[PDB]
Design a protein around this ligand. Structure first.
Ligand SMILES: CC(=O)N[C@@H]1[C@@H](O)[C@H](O[C@@H]2O[C@H](CO)[C@@H](O)[C@H](O)[C@H]2NC(C)=O)[C@@H](CO)O[C@H]1O
Length: 858
């Protein structure tokens, strides 16, 4: 009843990691069905400061990205609902939560939990009648309230983990090659780095303002430029420094004769931008804006530059489905993109856990798919996921919101690429279309009910998705209703784009992870168990759609060869729908198109793939095959440009970490996307080990670069911003500019981490030192002004010769120290180091002085 829920709500949870490598320490993880026989032991403690809780009519719901495999307190049991939602229940042996005591529940989970961010907030209790209530101490974004600190070697994945734990003292060493450059060395430095620049000794004076000739630009675009000058403190007034613009396509030849190319001349009396096109003028204007200092000085170097993008596709991907991100945050993101010349916004509008775009005629997609709540019937909501509580959590962009975002992007020279992920990652859509089916079926409108249905009612396939959903995550590719649904959604989104004035140029099909994970390599069958694998019953495990009658008749009429070719076949069918709507380019995650013969199998004349295989695992060689089959390769490797991954190896950092353990501003910058094998000399793998890389195949080159923000643990907009910035500035650099240390691809060259020395790592180093300095001394102050809650790096620090020595990953940022427990903070001066004794803490501070990094002890 309610009373029981009220009592349970007052239980205080504490989560403590016991062992991240339980399989190495006597637990038989294989017998528990753990992938690759890997499991961890965690302790859940529930403390009661009230009277005894003796009822048994309750369920406690919690979220985890890890499956619970064993419960070591026999008074309780844990069962999976779907996705990340689990239930804790009392067994027949439960004898109550005693008054004033703690109950301990040790559990065994699959894999490892290396970051405290792995533990999700907002556990909740239910009981019969009653309205669900959260366990109040867990209703927070601060994990310190319920998750204990990691100690010792608990951050290690295996006993052989070679990653380096980052503390102030080891971080001091990783930053020791950095130094603060004098302001003179940063004069005339545009970033992204221009293709060619000659900096002269005179400076132009922008203090009385600039007089802009934006006649070449459509109004909305000219207004973006004018607002940005004003933001950075240069008033716009007619008597100011003249900046002239013109478009002249004929002055550009060969490979500089591309959209976004420009010639820039900054003089003492005036400036002139000549673009190949409007993007080119807009971009030459953003290059002047990049020189404006963060010191109030109003001076910029005179210079002559000529520039053009190395790639036509320079993208940022955003997931709004896992956790919604508001219109205001999307706009801020687009502002910053435009400032650093990023031009493609890949918008992931749907997935299992949410559907975020209003579709005229299919209201259930947003009414149901657009919100999560504790509704076991899933008629009004999708089940709760990702630690957002049991009550309604959600949002979506209305048709007008969406049109607004597209217009906003268009002014900023950014192309909006909508992604509606299929045929896996489609639970919001499938469940919403089921609620639609039920509603219409009840009114006796059976043809209407079935019109956009995404389920074959005969399908009993037993399949587990990557995120542990079942067959409801997989839209059925063989149904005529599924094609109707696809056609209708493409149609409606295409109309919004037409109204916004930016007609869709690329449809993103999705296509990722359309498989059953129980049939993967790390699991083994109960009957002939291979050692070191998760022992499960694999004889009742099906490939997706295996038991669909409709898919079976499709296979027998000869339309497709096997169940395995379904995803690729569906990609080919959707390309025909995309083409029919006037769209001549489709893009997909490469694994959904793997069984297609080549780009020729598609109806669009262009087919792009987001290439998301990790490099250290073979990506440096398998990427070639896509480019050579006609696909435009959009480099999206998780080991370098997944922005949902942690900035550093520290258990208190935010992020997922399946593809690598960290990717900081420096690592992202060091990525060489057009000569994949070379990264073997400049990076380490997910366990910190050196790797080797070689390809013997032809490499025509990549078409683009994209950095991804997946949103599982990015629950708020500030969290999203913490993960994207400032490392997306490194992405902008590398997607625009090819550095001298980025060598040409050579078939047969084998790069061996720690052994070969092909790459000019001293040039790489010098390039990074300058770039890190531009961020710390100029650009971060601009992000402050754009309202972006970027991550402030924690300082490196050591105590030497009686004084505190501190450093930082982005030289120029302020550093503070405290010698009294973090009560009083003082500013660090490198040229008058402070004498120190006992405990010191350090923290960094934003340029505007309002935000601080986390504080750490030396
Ligand atoms: C708990 C965990 O780490 N799971 C991993 C999945 O998240 C991951 O899926 C892919 O990665 C993204 C997160 O970085 C997902 O949001 C996304 O849906 C998915 N697909 C794409 C194209 O990235 C997979 C990758 O094999 O591994 C898991 O272990």
């Amino acid at each position: 009843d309610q009373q029981l829920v009220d009592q349970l709500s007052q239980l205080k949870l504490n989560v403590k990691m016991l062992d991240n490598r339980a399989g190495e320490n006597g637990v038989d993880c294989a017998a528990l069905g753990a992938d690759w026989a890997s499991c961890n032991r965690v302790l859940f403690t529930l403390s009661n400061d009230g009277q005894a809780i003796d009822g048994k009519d309750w369920v406690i719901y919690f979220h985890s990205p890890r499956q619970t495999l064993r419960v070591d307190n026999d008074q309780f049991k844990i069962a999976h609902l779907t996705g990340d939602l689990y239930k804790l229940e009392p067994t027949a042996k439960f004898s109550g939560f005693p008054a004033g005591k703690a109950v301990e529940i040790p559990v065994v989970a699959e894999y490892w939990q290396l970051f405290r961010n792995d533990f999700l907030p907002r556990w909740y209790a239910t009981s019969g009648d009653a309205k669900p209530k959260m366990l109040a101490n867990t209703d927070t974004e601060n994990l310190d309230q319920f998750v204990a600190p990691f100690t010792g070697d608990q951050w290690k994945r295996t006993k052989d983990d070679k990653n380096i734990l980052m503390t102030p003292a080891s971080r001091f060493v990783s930053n020791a090659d950095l130094q603060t450059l004098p302001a003179g060395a940063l004069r005339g430095k545009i970033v992204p780095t221009p293709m060619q620049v000659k900096v002269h000794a005179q400076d132009a004076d922008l203090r009385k303002g600039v007089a802009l000739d934006l006649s070449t630009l459509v109004k909305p675009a000219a207004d973006v430029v004018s607002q940005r000058f004003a933001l950075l403190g240069v008033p716009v007034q007619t008597n100011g420094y003249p900046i002239k613009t013109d478009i002249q396509p004929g002055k550009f030849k060969g490979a500089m004769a591309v959209s976004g190319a420009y010639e820039l001349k900054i003089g003492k009396k005036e400036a002139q931008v000549i673009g190949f096109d409007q993007a080119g003028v807009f971009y030459g204007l953003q290059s002047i804006l990049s020189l404006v200092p963060s010191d109030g000085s109003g001076k910029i170097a005179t210079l002559d530059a000529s520039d053009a993008p190395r790639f036509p596709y320079r993208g940022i991907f955003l997931d709004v489905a896992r956790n919604f991100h508001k219109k205001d945050a999307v706009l801020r993101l687009l502002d910053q993109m435009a400032a650093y010349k990023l031009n493609k916004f890949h918008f992931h509008l749907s997935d299992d856990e949410g559907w975020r775009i209003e579709i005229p005629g299919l209201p259930e997609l947003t009414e149901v798919g657009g919100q999560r709540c504790h509704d076991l019937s899933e008629t009004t909501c999708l089940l709760p996921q990702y630690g957002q509580g049991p009550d309604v959590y959600g949002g979506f962009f209305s048709r007008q919101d969406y049109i607004d975002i597209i217009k906003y992007a268009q002014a900023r020279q950014i192309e909006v690429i909508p992604e509606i992920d299929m045929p896996a990652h489609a639970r919001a859509a499938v469940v919403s279309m089921e609620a639609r089916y039920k509603k219409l079926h009840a009114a006796g409108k059976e043809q209407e009910a079935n019109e956009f249905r995404l389920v074959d009612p005969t399908d009993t396939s037993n399949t587990t998705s990557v995120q542990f959903f079942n067959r409801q995550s997989y839209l059925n590719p063989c149904l005529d209703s599924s094609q109707r649904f696809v056609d209708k959604v493409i149609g409606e989104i295409a109309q919004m784009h037409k109204e916004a004035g930016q007609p869709i140029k690329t449809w993103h099909f999705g296509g990722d992870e359309a498989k059953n994970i129980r049939l993967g390599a790390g699991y083994t069958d109960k009957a002939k168990p291979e050692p070191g694998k998760g022992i499960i019953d694999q004889g009742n495990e099906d490939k997706p759609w295996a038991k669909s009658q409709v898919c079976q008749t499709m296979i027998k009429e000869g339309k497709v060869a096997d169940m395995e070719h379904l995803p690729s076949y569906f990609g080919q069918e959707v390309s025909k729908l995309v083409k029919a709507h006037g769209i001549d380019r489709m893009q997909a995650w490469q694994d959904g198109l793997k069984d297609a013969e080549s780009s020729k199998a598609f109806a669009t004349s262009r087919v792009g793939v987001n290439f998301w295989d990790t490099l250290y695992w073979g990506g440096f060689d398998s990427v070639n095959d896509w480019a050579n089959k006609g696909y435009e390769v959009v480099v999206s490797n998780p080991d370098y440009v997944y922005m949902d991954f942690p900035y550093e190896v520290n258990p208190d950092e935010r992020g997922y970490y399946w593809g690598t353990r960290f990717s900081d501003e420096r690592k992202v910058f060091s990525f060489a996307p057009d000569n994949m094998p070379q990264n073997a000399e400049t990076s380490v793998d997910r366990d910190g080990n050196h790797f080797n890389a070689k390809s013997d195949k032809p490499w025509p080159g990549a078409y683009g670069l994209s950095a991804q923000l997946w949103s599982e643990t990015q629950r708020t907009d500030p969290q999203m911003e913490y993960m994207i910035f400032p490392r997306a500035l490194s992405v902008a650099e590398r997607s625009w500019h090819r550095a001298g240390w980025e060598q040409d691809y050579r078939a047969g060259r084998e790069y061996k981490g720690g052994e070969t020395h092909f790459v000019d790592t001293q040039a790489l180093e010098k390039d990074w030192l300058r770039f890190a300095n531009i961020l710390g001394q100029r650009e971060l102050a601009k992000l402050d002004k754009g309202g972006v809650a970027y991550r402030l790096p924690v300082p490196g620090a050591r105590v030497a010769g009686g004084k505190l020595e501190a450093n930082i990953a982005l030289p120029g940022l302020g550093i503070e120290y405290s010698t009294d427990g973090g009560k009083q903070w003082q500013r660090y001066d490198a040229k008058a180091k402070p004498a120190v004794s006992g405990e010191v803490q350090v923290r960094s501070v934003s340029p505007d002085g309002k935000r601080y990094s986390r504080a750490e002890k030396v």
